[PDB]
C-alpha cells in the first residue's frame, strides 16, 4: 500500500485515513479565501513542530513577509522557524525553478514542500505539459508537495484551466458555498491514487487554532453505556423515570410554547451545581439577564452558581453564526469548562432557516460528542402546533423524551407531562398533571376521566 | 495579529471585527449603483472628520466637480475639505506614471487613507500583472488603499476578468439582488488575509446619513431584564397577566380577522399617553383616518395624544418598502421620538409575499432592538384560518402571547381571549369570553359548559 | 451476433449481457478519480489471471512504476507479471510511430487485450481524424482494446471535444455525481454497436477487491420459498404468527419511537444463538455499549453470544457512508460470518436525508440478497407520528408486517402489537396489548371495550 504522512490537521487525517501519500504531490484547488494558503502553511508548520522535518515553501504572489505576518494571527511565528533553519520561504513573486527547489530539498532535508500558488506561475495545452513536468520532477526527488490552484465556480471546473486534476496524483477541493446569505466552508478529497479515502464534502471552520475539519463519517457508535443515574431536579420526575436520567444519555424535552421546557432545563442545571458538579447552559431563545430573572421567580439563583464556577451560560442568536461554528463553539467551551451536565435551549431555534440535512448533521455531532465525553445532554424542542409528532425523524438520537402538552379542561388551560422513552430503564407510562408555582413545578396525578388527550379535551 | 483601521461606517466596524487591515488595500466589487463610490468617499471622509487623517481620492471617469456634487446629497461638503488640505481629489482625466503622481501626492499631504474609484476603466493575464504592481507600490507606502472593482452578474464572477480577488489581500462584495421585483442591498466580506471577519451576506440600506449596515450577527443576547410591570389599557387584562406586562418584554396578540388585535394595540398606546409616556403606532393595514375613526368609536382621542406629543402614528403599505427599509425607518423614528411603548400592526402584513429568511431576520432585528432599548412592544399577527397555531417559529421571540379566537355558540359568533403564556410571571390559565363596545374590551368569564375551544373547533 | 469477452468485473458481465465486443475497442470516459485507470488495469489483469491472455498497457502521463505502486493497493503485483511476460506496460514517456510500437508489441507477446490510458493527453476536427485512424489500426489487429477518455462535466458532454463517442463502437461512462455533499459512483453503457446491453446508470463502489458493480436490474425474481418456520424469541408471537416466521421471509417491525422494535430485534437474534445458529445485528441508531446495557437489562447476554461466535454486532452512523457502501458492507460481512438470521435497526435511519430512488433501490438490493441467500431478515421502521401508515411503498418487499403502537387509556400510555399481515400463513388478526419488563415482551389480551385503535386515535 502507499505510505501516508500525518498533516496533523484535526479531522483531515480521518478524511484520508492516514494523511497524504508520501513521495507524491497533493493539489488543493478552491475559490478565493477558501483557506488554500492556510492549509499549505499549516501542513509545513505541523510537520516542523511535531516531526522536526525541514520543509520548503514556494511563493508566487504574496511576499514572504506577508505570509509570515498573515500566519502570525493563528499564534505561530514562521521567521523564528526560518531563523532556526527548519523552514525556507523561497520568494518567486521554468526548468531551473524545479532544480533550485530540488537543490534546497537535498540541502535542507527534503521533508514537506508547499507551492502557493502555481496558477499565477503558469498565468490549457501548455498548462498540462508545464504542470506534468513539475509533478514528474518533484516525483524524482520523492518529497511530499502540496500545490494550491484557483477555481472560478464553487461547483464548476476543479481548476482554472481544467487539466491539473488529471496531471495531479491527489485532488482536494476547498469550497466556500453561499446558501441563504450564509457561507459554508467544506473540504472534500476528489481522489487518492492507489489509496482509500472518505468521499463527499465535510464541513470545516477556521479559528485561532487554524483549519478545524469536523468529520461526521469518522464518528462511530462506540459511546460507552453505564447504569449510573443522575437526578433530573424533580423528585417526582426521577420516580417517573424509575430512578432519574442515565449519566450516559440524551434527554429530549419537546412541547408547545410556554409549557415549561426552560423550567426543566433550569432545574436540571441547578441540580448539577447542588452536587458541586460543573454544567454549561447554551441559550439561543432567551438572554442571561432574562434567564436570571426567570429562574429567580421559580426560586433558583443562577448568579450564585456562576459565582461558585459550577454553572456557565452562553447566550447567542442561531443566525449570529453557522452550525459548523455553533458546534465548534460548544466543543471549545466544553473543552475548557469540562462540565458534568449540558443543556441546549433549544435545537428548534437552531433549525430556523437551515438545510434540514445541515441541521440533522449538527444534532449527531452534538449528541455524539456529549455521549463520547460521558456528558448528560438535555435538548429542548418547541412544537410549531399548539396543543404533536417529531416531524424530523431525529428521535433515534435521543435515549429519553419528556412530552409536555396543554389539556384544555373546563374552559381552563392546564399542562401535562409524560415520559415516552427510557431505554434500559422502567418509566411511569402515565400522563400526570403538573403546574408551575414560585417554588418550581409540581407533578400531581393523571386524568382518568378524559382519555382523549394528544388531540383535545374529553 | 494585523492592525485594523476603523472606517466609521455603522455595522462595517462589527462585520470586519474592527475595520480594514492597516498598510494593505481592500477591493470593493459590485454591479452598477451598489454603493462602491459612496463606500469609497465615506471611508476617506470619516478619516478626515474623526481621526483627522489626510486622504487622497483617484477619479478616472467621474470628475471632481461631480464627486463633490453627488457627495453633497448625503450632507457633507468636499470642496471645503479640498480647500483646507485634509482631502485631495486626484483627477485621472503607464501604471508607473499614474503610480508616481499618486506616490508624489501621498507624501505631499501625507495621506493615511487612499481610494481608487475605479480600476476597471484604465484596463486576464495583463490585469493580474498590472493589479499586482499597483498593490505592491501601495504596500511599500504603507497607506490603507480601497480599490473599487466592477462585476456583471450578482452571484457570478467576483470581478470582471475574475482575477482581482487572488491579487487583493481583502475582498468586499456589494450586491443588489432582485427577488420578486424588489431590490435588496447586501454586503459580504469574502476574505481578510491575516485578521478574522463575519462570513455571509448582511443587509444594508443607503439613506441621507450614507450606508447603514444592519449586522444581525453582531447583535448579542445581552438584553437587560427587570421585574418592573406596566398596564395594557385593560384592568382585567393586567390582572389576567398577574399585575400587567413587564416593562422589558415582547407581547404578541395573534388571532383570526376582527378578533380585536387593533383594539388591544390602541388601549396599549392610550395607557402610555395616560401616564404622560411617549409611544409610537406602526400601522401597515389601516390608515390614520380609519384608526382615528375606530379609536374615537372606542372612546380614545388619538388627536389629543397626537397634540400632547405622547403618541406618533406612522402608516405605510407593507409593499411600499423592503424589510431593510421598514427596520431602518422604525429605528430612525424611535431614536427621534424616544418612545417607552411601541406597537406594530402588524407582522403578518409585513410577511406579505416576503422570504421566510428575510422576514425571520427582520423580526429578530426589531424585537432585539426594542429589548435592548427598554421599550415594551406589542406585535399583532392575523391567523390565516378563523378556527390555527403560531404562524412559524417566532414564539421564541415573544415573552408573552395573548391568543384571541371566535367560539360559535348557539348560532352566535362570540370572541374569547386568554393569556397563552407569560415568562417570569403567573398568568390566568383560563379561556375567558370577552365582548367589544364603544368603551373597549369587556373580559367576562370562561365557558365551563364546553371545554373544546382554544386551538380547536367546538 | 457479435462475440463478447468476459472482463471478470463483478456486475459488468451482467450489465454488458456478457462483456465487451471482441475485435473492437471500448471508450471509457469520466471525470478525475472515477476509476478509468482501475477499470483499465482490472480488465487486462483478469485477462492474464483467468484466461491467461497476454495484454499490453499503454501509459502516457502515469509511469509504469506508479501504475504498479497504485495497482498493489488492491492486492495484485504487476511487476511479477511484467517479469514473466503475461503483461507488458508500454510506457509512452506521430500516431503511426506510436501505432507501430503498439502494433510491434501486440505480436511480440501476442496480446489479446489492450488498454490505452489515456488518449486525452497526446492531443475537434483533428481529434476525430486521429481517433478514427487509431481504432482502424486496432480493428485490423483484432485485439479487444479499451481507450480511457476525460470529461469536465458529470452530465455534460460525454468526452472533452464531444466527438470520441461517434468514432468509438462502444461507450462506457463512469460518473461521480455529488448530491447533498455525498459522492455516488455510477457506471452506464451508452451504446454497444452489434450486441445488446442494460440501459441506465448502475451504482458501483471501489474497495480492496477493485470495482464492485451492484446491478439491481440483473437481479431476477427467482427466490427459493419453503414452508420451514422459525421462532422469533417470543412463544406468544410465534403462536400469533401461526407457528412462527418462515425461514425464507422478510419481517418488518414498524411503529412509533419507544414501542419496542429493538426488543423484537434483540430476541430475534438471541433465539438464533439459542439454537447454535449464527446471526448479525446491523445497528445505525444505538451503539454496542447501549445495546449491551439494554440487552443485559432485558435478560439477554450479548457478550456471551459474541464470545460463542453466534452473534456479530456492527454499529455505524447512517451518514457515515452511502447506501452503495452500506449495501456492499452488509454483503461482505454476511459472506464472511455466513449468518442464518439478519436484523437491520433501522431502515428509517438509513433513509435520513437520502433520495427516495436511491433508498428504494437499496431496500430491494438488501431484501433480494437475503431472500436469495436463505437468510431470515427482521427490518425495523420508526414512524414519524406517535399516533401512521407504511412510510412509502416498501410493503411489497416485506412478507410479514408486525405493527406496534401506543393506546392512551385512562391517562396511561400502554403499547399494543398485532401481526398486520403474513403471506402463506394464518396469523392472529387481533390487536393484543403487551407490556415490557426485564424479561422481555409480555403479549396479553386485546381491547374489546374500545374498537378504534389500529391506525387511528381513540
Ligand atoms: N485569526 C483568524 N481567525 C479566524 N479566521 C481567520 C483568521 N485568520 C484568517 N482567517 C480566515 O482565513 C482566511 C485566510 O485566507 P487564505 O489566504 O487562507 O485563503 P486562500 O484560499 O489561500 O486565499 P487566496 O489564495 O485567494 O489568497 C481569511 O480570509 C479568514 O477567512
Ligand atoms: N413565576 C411563575 N409562577 C407561575 N407560573 C410561572 C412562573 N413563571 C413562568 N410560569 C409559567 O410557566 C411558563 C414558563 O415556561 P418556560 O419559561 O419554561 O417556557 P417554555 O415552555 O420553554 O416555552 P418557550 O421557550 O416557547 O417560551 C410561563 O409561560 C407561565 O405559564
Ligand atoms: N441622498 C441619497 N439618499 C438615498 N440614497 C441615495 C442618495 N444618494 C445616492 N443614493 C443611492 O446610492 C446610489 C449611489 O451609488 P454610487 O454613486 O456609489 O454608485 P456605484 O456603486 O459607484 O456604481 P457606479 O460606479 O456603477 O455608478 C444611488 O443609485 C441611490 O440608490
Ligand atoms: N364601536 C363598536 N362597537 C361594537 N363592536 C365594535 C365596534 N367597533 C368595532 N367592533 C367590533 O370589533 C371589531 C374591530 O376590529 P379590530 O381592529 O378590533 O380587530 P382586528 O383583529 O384588528 O381585525 P383585522 O384582522 O381585520 O385587522 C369589528 O370587526 C367588530 O366586530
Ligand atoms: N485500495 C483502495 N481501496 C479503496 N478505494 C481505492 C483504493 N485505491 C484507489 N481507490 C479509489 O479509486 C480511485 C482511483 O481511481 P483511478 O486512479 O483509476 O483514477 P482515474 O479514474 O484514472 O482518474 P484520473 O485519470 O483523473 O487520475 C481513488 O481516487 C480512490 O477513491
Ligand atoms: N428494563 C425495562 N423495564 C421496563 N420497560 C423497559 C425496560 N427497558 C426498556 N423499557 C421500555 O421499552 C422501551 C425500550 O425501547 P425499544 O428499543 O424497545 O423501542 P424502540 O422502538 O427501539 O425505540 P426507538 O424508536 O427510540 O429506537 C423504553 O422506552 C421503555 O418504555
Ligand atoms: Mg492564498
Ligand atoms: Mg423556553
Ligand atoms: Mg461609481
Ligand atoms: Mg387589525
Ligand atoms: Mg488515471
Ligand atoms: Mg430502536
CSV table of C-alpha atoms and ligand atoms in Angstrom, one decimal, chain A residues 423, chain C residues 258 261-263 285-286 345 380 382, ligand 12:
chain,number,residue,atom,x,y,z
A,423,UNK,CA,-34.1,2.9,27.1
C,258,UNK,CA,-40.0,3.5,22.1
C,261,UNK,CA,-38.7,-2.6,17.8
C,262,UNK,CA,-35.1,-3.1,19.2
C,263,UNK,CA,-36.6,-5.5,21.8
C,285,UNK,CA,-29.3,4.2,15.9
C,286,UNK,CA,-27.7,2.8,19.1
C,345,UNK,CA,-32.1,-1.4,13.1
C,380,UNK,CA,-37.4,-2.1,11.9
C,382,UNK,CA,-39.7,4.2,13.2
D,12,LIG,MG1,-34.9,1.2,18.4
